[PDB]
PDB file of C-alpha atoms and ligand atoms in Angstrom:
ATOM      1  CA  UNK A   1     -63.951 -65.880  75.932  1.00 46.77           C
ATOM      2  CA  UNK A   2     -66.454 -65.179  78.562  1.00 48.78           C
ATOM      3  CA  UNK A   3     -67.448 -62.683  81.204  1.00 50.99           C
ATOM      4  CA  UNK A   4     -65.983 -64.601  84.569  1.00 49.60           C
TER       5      UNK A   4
ATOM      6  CA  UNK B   1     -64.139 -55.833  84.330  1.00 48.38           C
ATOM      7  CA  UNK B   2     -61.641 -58.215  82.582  1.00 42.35           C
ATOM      8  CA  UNK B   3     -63.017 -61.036  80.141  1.00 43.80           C
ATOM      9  CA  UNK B   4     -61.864 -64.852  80.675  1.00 45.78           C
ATOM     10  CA  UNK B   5     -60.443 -67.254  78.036  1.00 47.66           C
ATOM     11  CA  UNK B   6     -62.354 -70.608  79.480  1.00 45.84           C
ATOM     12  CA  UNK B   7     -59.462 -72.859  78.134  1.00 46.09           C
ATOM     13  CA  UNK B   8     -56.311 -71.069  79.045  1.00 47.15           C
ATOM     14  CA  UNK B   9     -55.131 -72.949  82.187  1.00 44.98           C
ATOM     15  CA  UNK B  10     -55.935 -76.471  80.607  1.00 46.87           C
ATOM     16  CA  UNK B  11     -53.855 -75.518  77.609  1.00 50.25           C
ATOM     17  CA  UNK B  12     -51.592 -74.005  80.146  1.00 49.35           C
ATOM     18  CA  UNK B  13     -51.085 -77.286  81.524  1.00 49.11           C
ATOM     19  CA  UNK B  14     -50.978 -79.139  78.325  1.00 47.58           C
ATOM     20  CA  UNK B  15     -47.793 -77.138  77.474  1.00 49.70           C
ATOM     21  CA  UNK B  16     -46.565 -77.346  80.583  1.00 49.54           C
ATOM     22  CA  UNK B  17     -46.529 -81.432  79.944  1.00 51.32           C
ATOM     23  CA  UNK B  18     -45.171 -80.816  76.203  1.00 48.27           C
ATOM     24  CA  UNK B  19     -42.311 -79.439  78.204  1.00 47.62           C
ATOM     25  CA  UNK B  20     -41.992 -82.846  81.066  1.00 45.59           C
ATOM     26  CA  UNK B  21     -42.024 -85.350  78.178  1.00 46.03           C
ATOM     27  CA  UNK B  22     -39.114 -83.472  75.740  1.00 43.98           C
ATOM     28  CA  UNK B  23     -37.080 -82.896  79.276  1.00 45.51           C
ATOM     29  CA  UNK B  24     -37.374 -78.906  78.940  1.00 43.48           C
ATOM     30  CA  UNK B  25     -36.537 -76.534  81.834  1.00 40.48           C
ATOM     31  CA  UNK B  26     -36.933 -79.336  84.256  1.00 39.52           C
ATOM     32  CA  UNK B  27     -35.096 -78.438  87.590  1.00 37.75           C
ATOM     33  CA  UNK B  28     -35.088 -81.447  89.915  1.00 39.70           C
ATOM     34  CA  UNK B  29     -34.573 -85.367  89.502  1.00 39.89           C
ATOM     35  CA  UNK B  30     -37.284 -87.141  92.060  1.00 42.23           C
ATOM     36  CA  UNK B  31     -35.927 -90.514  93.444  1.00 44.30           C
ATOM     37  CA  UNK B  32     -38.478 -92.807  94.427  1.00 43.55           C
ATOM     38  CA  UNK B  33     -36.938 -96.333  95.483  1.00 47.49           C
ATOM     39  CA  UNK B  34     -34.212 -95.928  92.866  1.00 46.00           C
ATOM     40  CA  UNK B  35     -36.583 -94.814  90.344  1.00 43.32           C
ATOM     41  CA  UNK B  36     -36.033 -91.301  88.856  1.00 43.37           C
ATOM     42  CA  UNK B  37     -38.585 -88.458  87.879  1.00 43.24           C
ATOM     43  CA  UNK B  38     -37.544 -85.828  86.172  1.00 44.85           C
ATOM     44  CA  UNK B  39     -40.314 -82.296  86.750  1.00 45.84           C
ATOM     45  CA  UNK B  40     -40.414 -78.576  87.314  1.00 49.99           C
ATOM     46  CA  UNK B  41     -40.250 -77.724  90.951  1.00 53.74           C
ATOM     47  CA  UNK B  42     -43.060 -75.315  90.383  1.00 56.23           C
ATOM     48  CA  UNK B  43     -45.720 -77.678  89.080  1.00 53.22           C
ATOM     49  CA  UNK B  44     -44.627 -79.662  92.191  1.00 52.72           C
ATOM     50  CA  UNK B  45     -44.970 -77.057  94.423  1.00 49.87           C
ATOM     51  CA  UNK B  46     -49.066 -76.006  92.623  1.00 48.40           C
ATOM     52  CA  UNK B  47     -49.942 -79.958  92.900  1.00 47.10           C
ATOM     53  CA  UNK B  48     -48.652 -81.097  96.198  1.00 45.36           C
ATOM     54  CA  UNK B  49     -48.688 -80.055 100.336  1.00 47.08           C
ATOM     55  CA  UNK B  50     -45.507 -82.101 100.343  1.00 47.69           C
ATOM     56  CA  UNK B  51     -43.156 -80.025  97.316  1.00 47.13           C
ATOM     57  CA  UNK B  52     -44.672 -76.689  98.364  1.00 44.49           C
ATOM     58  CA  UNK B  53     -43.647 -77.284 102.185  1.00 47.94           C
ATOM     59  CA  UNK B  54     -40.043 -78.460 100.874  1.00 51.00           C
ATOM     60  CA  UNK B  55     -39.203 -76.032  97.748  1.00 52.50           C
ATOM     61  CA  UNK B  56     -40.139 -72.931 100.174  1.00 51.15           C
ATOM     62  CA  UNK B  57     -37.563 -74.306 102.551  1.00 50.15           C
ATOM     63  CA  UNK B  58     -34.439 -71.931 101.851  1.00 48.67           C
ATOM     64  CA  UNK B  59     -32.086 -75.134 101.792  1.00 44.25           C
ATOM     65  CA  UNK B  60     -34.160 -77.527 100.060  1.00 40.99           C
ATOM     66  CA  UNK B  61     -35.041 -74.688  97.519  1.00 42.36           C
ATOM     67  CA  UNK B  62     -31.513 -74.979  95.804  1.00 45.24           C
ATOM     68  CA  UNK B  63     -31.473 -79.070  96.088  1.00 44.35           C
ATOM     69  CA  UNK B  64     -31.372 -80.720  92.660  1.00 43.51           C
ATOM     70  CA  UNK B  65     -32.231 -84.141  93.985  1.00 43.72           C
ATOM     71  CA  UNK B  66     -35.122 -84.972  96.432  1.00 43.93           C
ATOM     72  CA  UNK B  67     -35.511 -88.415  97.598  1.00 44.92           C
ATOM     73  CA  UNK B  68     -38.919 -89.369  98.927  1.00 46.95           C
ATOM     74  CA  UNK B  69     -39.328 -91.758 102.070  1.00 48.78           C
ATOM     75  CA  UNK B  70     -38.267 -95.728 100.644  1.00 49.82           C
ATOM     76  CA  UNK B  71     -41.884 -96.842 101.705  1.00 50.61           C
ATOM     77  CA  UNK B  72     -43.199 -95.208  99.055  1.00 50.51           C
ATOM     78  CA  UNK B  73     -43.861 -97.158  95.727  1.00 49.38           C
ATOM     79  CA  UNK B  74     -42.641 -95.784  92.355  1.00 47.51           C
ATOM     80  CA  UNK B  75     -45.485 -96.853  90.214  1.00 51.33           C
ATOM     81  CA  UNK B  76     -47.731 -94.626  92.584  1.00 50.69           C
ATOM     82  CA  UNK B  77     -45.884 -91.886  92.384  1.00 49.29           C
ATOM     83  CA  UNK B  78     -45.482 -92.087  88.456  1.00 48.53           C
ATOM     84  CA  UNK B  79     -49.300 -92.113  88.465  1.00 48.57           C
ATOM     85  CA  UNK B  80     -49.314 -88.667  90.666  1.00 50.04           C
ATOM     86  CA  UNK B  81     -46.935 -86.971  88.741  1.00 53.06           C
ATOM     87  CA  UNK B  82     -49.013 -87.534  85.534  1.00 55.33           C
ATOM     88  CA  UNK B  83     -52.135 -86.705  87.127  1.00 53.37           C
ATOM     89  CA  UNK B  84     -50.387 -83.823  88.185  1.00 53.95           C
ATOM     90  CA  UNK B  85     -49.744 -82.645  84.063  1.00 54.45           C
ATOM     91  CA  UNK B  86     -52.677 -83.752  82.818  1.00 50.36           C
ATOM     92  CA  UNK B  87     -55.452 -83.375  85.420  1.00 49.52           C
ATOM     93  CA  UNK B  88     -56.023 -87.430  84.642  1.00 47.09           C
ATOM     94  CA  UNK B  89     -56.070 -89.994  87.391  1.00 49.32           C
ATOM     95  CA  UNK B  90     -55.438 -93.417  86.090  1.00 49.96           C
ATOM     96  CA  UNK B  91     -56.877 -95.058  88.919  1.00 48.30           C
ATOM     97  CA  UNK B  92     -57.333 -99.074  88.939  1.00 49.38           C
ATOM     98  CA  UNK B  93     -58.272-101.912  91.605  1.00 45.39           C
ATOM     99  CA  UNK B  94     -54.414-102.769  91.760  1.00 47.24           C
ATOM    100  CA  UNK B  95     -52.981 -99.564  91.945  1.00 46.66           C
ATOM    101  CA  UNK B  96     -55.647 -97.334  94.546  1.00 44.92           C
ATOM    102  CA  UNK B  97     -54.011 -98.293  97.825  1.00 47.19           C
ATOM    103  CA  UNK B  98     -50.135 -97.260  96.649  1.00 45.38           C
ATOM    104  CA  UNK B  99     -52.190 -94.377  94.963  1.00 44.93           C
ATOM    105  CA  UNK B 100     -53.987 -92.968  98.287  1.00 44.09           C
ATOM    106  CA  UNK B 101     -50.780 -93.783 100.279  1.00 46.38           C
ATOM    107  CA  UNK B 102     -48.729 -91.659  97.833  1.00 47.93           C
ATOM    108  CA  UNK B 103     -50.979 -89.239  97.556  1.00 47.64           C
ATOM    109  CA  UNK B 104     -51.433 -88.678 101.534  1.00 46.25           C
ATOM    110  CA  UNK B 105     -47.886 -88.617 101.820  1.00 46.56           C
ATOM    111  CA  UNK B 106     -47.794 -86.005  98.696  1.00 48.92           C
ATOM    112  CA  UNK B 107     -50.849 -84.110 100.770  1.00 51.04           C
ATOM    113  CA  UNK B 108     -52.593 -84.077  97.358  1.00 54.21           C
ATOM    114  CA  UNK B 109     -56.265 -83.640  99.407  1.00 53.96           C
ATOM    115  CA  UNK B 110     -58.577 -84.342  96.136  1.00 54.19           C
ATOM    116  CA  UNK B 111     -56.724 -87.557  95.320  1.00 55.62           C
ATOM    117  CA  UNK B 112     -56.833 -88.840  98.624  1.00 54.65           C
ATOM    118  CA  UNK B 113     -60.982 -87.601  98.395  1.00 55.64           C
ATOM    119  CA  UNK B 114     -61.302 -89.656  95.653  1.00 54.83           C
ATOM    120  CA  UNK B 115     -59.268 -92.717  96.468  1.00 53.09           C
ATOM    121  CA  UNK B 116     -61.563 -92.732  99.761  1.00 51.53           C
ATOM    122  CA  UNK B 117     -64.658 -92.913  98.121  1.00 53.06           C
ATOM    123  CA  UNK B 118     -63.516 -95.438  95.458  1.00 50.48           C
ATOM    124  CA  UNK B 119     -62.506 -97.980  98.450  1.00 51.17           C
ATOM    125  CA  UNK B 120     -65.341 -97.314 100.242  1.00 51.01           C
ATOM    126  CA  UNK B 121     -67.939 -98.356  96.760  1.00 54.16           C
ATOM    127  CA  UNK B 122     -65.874-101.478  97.197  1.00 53.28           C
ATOM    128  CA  UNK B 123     -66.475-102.527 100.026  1.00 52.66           C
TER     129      UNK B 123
ATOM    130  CA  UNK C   1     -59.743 -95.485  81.824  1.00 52.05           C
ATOM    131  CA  UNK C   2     -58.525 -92.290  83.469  1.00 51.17           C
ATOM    132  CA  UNK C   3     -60.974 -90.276  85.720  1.00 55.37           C
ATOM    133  CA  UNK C   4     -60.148 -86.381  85.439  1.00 56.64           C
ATOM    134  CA  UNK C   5     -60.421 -83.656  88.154  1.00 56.67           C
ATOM    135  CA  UNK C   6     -62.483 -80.788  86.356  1.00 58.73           C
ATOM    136  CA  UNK C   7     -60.510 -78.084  88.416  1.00 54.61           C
ATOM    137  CA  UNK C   8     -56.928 -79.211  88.154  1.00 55.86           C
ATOM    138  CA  UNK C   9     -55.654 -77.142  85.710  1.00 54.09           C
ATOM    139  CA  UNK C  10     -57.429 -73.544  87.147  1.00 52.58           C
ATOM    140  CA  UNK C  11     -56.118 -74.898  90.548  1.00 54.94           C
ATOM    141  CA  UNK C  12     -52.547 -75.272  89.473  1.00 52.85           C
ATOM    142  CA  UNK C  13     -52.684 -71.727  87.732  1.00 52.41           C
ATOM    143  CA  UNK C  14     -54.110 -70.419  90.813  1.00 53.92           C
ATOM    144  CA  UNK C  15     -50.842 -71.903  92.783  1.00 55.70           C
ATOM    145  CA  UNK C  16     -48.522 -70.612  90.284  1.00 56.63           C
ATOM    146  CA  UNK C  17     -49.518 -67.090  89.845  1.00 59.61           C
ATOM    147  CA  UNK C  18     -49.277 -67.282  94.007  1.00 64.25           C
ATOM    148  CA  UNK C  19     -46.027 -68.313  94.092  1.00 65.60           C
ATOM    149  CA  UNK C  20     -45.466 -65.297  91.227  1.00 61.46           C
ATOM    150  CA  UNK C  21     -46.832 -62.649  94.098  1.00 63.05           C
ATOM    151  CA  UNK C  22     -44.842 -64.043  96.674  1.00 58.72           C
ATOM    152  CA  UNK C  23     -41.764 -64.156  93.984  1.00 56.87           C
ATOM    153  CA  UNK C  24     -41.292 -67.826  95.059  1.00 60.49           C
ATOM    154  CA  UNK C  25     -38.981 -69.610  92.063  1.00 62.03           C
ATOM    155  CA  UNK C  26     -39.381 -66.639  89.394  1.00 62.06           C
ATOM    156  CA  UNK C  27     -35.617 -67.232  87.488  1.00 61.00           C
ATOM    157  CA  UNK C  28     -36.190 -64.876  84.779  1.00 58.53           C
ATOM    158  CA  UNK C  29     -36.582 -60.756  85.136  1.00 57.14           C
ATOM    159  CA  UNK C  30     -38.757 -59.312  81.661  1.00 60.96           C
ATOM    160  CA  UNK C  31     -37.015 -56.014  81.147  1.00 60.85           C
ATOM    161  CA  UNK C  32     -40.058 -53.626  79.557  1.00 59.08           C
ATOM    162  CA  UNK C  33     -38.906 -50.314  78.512  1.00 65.24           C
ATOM    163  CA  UNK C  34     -36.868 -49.266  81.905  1.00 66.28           C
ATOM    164  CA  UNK C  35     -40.071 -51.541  83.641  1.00 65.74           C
ATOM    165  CA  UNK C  36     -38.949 -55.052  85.325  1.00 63.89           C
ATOM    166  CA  UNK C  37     -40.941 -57.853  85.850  1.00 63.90           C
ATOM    167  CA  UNK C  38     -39.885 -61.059  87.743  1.00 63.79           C
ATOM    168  CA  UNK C  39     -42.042 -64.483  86.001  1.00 63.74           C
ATOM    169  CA  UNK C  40     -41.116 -68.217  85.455  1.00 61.52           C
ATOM    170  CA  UNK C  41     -39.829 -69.068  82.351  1.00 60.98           C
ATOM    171  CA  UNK C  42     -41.741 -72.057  81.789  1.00 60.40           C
ATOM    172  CA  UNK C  43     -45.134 -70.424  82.560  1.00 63.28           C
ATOM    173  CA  UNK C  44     -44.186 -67.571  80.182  1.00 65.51           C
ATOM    174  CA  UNK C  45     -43.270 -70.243  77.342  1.00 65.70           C
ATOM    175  CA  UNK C  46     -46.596 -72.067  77.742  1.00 67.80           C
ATOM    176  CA  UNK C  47     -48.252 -69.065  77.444  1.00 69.36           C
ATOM    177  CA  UNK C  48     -46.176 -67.191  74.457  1.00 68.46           C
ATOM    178  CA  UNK C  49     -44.625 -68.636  70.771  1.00 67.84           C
ATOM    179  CA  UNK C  50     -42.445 -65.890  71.432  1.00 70.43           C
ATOM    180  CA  UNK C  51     -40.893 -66.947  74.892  1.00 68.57           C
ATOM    181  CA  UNK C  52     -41.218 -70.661  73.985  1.00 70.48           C
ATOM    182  CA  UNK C  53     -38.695 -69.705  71.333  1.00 69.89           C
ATOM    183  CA  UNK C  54     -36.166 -67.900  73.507  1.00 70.93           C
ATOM    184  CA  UNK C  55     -36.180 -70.336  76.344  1.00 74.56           C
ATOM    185  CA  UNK C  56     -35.771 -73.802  74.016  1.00 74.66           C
ATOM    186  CA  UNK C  57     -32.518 -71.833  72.692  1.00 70.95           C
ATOM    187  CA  UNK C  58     -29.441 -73.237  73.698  1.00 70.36           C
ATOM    188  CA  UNK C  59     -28.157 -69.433  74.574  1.00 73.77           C
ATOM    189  CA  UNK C  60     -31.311 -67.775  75.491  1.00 72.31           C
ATOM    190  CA  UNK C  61     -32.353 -71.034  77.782  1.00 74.14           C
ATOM    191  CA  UNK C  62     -29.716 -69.848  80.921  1.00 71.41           C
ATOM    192  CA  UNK C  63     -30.212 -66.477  80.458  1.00 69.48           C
ATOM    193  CA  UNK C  64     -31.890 -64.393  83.818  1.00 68.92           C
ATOM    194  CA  UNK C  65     -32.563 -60.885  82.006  1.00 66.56           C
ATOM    195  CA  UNK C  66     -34.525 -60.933  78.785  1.00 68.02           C
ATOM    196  CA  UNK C  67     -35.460 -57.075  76.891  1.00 66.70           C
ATOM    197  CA  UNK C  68     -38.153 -56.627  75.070  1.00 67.04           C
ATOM    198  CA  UNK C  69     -38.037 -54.363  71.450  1.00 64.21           C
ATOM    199  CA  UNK C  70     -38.092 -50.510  72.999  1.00 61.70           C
ATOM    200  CA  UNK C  71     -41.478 -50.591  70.932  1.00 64.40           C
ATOM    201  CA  UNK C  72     -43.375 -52.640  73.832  1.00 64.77           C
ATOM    202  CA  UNK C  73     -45.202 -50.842  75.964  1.00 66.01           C
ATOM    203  CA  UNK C  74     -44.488 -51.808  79.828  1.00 65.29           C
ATOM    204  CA  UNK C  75     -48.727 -51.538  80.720  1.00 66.82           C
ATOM    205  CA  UNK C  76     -49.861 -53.796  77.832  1.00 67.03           C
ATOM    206  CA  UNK C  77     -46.931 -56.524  78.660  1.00 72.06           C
ATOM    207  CA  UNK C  78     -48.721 -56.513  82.431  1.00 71.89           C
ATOM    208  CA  UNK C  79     -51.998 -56.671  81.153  1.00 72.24           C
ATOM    209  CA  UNK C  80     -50.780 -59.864  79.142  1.00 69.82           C
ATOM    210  CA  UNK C  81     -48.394 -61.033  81.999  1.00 70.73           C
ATOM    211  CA  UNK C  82     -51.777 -61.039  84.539  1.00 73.80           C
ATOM    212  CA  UNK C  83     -53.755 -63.249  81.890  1.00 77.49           C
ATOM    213  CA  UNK C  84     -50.705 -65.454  81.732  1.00 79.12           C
ATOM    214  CA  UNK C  85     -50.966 -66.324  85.315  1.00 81.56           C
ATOM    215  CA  UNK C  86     -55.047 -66.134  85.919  1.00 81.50           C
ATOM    216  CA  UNK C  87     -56.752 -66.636  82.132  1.00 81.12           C
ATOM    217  CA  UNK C  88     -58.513 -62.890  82.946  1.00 82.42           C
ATOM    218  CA  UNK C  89     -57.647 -60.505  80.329  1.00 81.34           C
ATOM    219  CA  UNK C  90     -57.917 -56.376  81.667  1.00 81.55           C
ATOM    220  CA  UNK C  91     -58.897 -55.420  78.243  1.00 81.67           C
ATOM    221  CA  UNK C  92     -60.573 -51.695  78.608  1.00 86.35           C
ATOM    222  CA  UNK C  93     -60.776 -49.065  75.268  1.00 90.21           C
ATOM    223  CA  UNK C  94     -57.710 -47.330  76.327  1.00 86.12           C
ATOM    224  CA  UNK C  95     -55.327 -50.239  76.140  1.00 86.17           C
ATOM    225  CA  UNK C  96     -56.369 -52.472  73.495  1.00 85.02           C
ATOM    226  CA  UNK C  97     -54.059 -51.089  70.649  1.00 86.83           C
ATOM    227  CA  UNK C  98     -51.332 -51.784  72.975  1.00 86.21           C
ATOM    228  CA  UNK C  99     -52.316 -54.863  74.616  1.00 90.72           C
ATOM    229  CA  UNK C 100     -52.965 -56.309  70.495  1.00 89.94           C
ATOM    230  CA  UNK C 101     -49.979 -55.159  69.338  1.00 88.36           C
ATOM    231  CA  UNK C 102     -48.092 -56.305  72.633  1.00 87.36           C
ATOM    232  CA  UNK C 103     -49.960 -60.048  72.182  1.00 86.93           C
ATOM    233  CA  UNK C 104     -48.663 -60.226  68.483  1.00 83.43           C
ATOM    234  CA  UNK C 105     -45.035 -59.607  69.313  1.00 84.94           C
ATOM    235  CA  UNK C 106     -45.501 -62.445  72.184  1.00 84.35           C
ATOM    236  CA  UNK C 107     -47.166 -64.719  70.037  1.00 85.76           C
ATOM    237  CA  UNK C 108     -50.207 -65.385  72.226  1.00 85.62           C
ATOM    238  CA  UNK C 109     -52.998 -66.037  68.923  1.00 86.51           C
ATOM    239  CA  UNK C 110     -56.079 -66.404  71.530  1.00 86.37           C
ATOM    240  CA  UNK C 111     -55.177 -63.106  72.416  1.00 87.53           C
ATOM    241  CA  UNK C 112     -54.927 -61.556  69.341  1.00 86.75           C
ATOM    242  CA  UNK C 113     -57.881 -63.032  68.284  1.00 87.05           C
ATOM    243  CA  UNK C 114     -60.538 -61.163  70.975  1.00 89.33           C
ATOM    244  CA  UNK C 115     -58.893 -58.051  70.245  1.00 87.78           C
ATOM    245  CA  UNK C 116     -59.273 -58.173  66.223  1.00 88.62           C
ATOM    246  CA  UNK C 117     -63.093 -58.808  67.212  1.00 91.86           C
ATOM    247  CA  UNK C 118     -63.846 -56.388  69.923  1.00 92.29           C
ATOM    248  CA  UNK C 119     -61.540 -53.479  67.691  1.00 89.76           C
ATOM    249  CA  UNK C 120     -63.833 -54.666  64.657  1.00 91.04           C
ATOM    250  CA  UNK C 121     -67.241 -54.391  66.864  1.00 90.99           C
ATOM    251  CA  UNK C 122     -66.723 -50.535  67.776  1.00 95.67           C
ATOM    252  CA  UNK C 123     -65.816 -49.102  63.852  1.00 99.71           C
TER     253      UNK C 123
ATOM    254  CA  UNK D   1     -64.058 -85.784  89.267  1.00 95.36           C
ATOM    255  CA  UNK D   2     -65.606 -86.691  85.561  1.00 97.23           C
ATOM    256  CA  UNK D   3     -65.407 -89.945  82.783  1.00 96.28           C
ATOM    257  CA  UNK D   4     -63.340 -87.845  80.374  1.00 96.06           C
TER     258      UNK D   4
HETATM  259  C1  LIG E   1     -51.644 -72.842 100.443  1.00100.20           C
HETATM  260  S1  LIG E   1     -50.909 -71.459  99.546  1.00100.20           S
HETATM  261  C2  LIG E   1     -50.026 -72.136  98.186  1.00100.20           C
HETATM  262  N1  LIG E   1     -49.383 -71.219  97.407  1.00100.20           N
HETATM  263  C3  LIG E   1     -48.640 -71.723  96.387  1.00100.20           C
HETATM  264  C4  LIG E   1     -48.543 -73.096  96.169  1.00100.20           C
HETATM  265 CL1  LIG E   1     -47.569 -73.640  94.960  1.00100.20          CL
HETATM  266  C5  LIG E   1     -49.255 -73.990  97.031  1.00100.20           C
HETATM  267  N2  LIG E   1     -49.348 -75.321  96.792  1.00100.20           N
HETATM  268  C6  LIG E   1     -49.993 -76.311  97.583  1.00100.20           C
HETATM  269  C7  LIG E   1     -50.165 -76.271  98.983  1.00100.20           C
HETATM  270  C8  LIG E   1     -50.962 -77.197  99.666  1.00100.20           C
HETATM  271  C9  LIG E   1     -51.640 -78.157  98.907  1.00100.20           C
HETATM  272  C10 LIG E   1     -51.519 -78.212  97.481  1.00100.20           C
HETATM  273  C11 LIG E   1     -50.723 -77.297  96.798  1.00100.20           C
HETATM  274  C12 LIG E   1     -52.351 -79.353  96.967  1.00100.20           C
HETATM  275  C13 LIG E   1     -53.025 -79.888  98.250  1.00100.20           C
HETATM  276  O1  LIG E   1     -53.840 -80.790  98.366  1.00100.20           O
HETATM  277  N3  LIG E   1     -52.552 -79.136  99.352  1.00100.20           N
HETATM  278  N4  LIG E   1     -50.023 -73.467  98.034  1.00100.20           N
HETATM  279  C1  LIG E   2     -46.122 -75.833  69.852  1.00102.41           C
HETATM  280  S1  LIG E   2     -45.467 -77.076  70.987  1.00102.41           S
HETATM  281  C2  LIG E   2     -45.230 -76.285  72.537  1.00102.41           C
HETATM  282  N1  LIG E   2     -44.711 -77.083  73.514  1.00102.41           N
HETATM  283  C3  LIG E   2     -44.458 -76.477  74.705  1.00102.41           C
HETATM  284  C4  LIG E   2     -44.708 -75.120  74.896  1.00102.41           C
HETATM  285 CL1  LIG E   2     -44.313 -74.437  76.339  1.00102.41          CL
HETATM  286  C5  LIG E   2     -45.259 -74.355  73.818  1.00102.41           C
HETATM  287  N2  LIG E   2     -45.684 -73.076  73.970  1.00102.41           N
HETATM  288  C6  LIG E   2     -46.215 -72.206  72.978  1.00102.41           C
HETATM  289  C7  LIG E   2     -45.907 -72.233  71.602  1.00102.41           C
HETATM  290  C8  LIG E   2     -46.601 -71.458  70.663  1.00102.41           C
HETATM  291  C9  LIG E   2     -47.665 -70.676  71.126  1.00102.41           C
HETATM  292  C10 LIG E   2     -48.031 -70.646  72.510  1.00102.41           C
HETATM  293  C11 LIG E   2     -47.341 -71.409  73.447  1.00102.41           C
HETATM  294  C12 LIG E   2     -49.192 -69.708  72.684  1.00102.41           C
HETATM  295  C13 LIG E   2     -49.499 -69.272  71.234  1.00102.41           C
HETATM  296  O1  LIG E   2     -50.391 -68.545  70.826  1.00102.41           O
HETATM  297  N3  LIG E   2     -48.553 -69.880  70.374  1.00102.41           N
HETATM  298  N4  LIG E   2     -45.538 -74.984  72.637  1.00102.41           N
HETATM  299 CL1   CL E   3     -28.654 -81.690  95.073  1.00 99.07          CL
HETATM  300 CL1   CL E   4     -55.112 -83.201  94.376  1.00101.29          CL
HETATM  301 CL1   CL E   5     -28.374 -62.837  82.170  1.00 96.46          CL
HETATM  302 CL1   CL E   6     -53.348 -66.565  74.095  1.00 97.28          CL
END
């Protein structure tokens, strides 16, 4: 997971 | 503020493929030069100008059968509709003309990008 | 000897959850508490063990309405049903019980996953 | 378009  | 899961649509697609090879959900039977494909309409529609234009059509919507124009070659399109599962092109010197010509006919732009600039190393 | 298009799969997603806003090809209506919400079945069972289950059932497959346990709360099955279709997840303090708990009944283990960790981070 |  990441911050787009 | 949402987060992103980086692999989701890949593994998206991968299912999505699981689902093409055991013949689940599939809605329409292409015919290529008496050659049949069996897809989903939807992936169809997300890959190609060409299924997008026809499945929004509110006749050719509701058609279970969709025969393509007898110029084009099976083994093309069979290399399209995988590309279109797996996001893999198996491009080769005997195959990239029937390749680009399927895949201009499809309007599948980054294919035809692709093919271009292949040919054009060649030469 | 494949080549592979780096944005095929996000690009495909992309086309699907447009056809989704458009309700272009949705055959399958989620009934949430009272709450409806129109989806493909084959993007929901690439996305969920729990409506991969349903829709490879030889009953469940040609069904067009599908309710969810009363238990289900209708705002963390959108939350999930938006991440589905675009890999962003609206995850936010006041919804996380539900969207877990709503991601563990769908079967969506990613899912469950980040919320386990961020719940974990803030006791 | 990659060598994947
Ligand atoms: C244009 S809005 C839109 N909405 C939904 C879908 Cl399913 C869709 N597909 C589509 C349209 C055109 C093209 C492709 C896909 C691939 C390509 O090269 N050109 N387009
Ligand atoms: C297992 S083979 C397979 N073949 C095709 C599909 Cl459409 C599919 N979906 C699916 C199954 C289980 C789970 C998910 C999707 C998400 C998750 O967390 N668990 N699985
Ligand atoms: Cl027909
Ligand atoms: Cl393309
Ligand atoms: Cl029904
Ligand atoms: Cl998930």
């Amino acid at each position: 997971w990441v911050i787009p | 503020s949402c987060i992103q899961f980086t692999r989701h649509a890949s593994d998206v697609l991968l299912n999505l493929n699981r689902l093409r090879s055991r013949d689940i959900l599939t809605d329409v039977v292409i015919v290529v030069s008496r050659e049949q494909f069996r897809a989903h309409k939807t992936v169809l529609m997300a890959c190609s100008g060409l299924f997008y234009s026809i499945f929004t059509d509110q006749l050719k919507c509701n058609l279970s059968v969709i025969n393509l124009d007898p110029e084009i070659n099976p083994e093309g399109f069979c290399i399209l509709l995988d590309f279109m599962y797996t996001s893999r092109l198996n491009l080769r010197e005997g195959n990239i003309m029937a390749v680009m010509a399927t895949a201009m006919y499809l309007q599948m732009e980054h294919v035809v990008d692709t093919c271009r600039k292949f040919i054009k190393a060649s030469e």
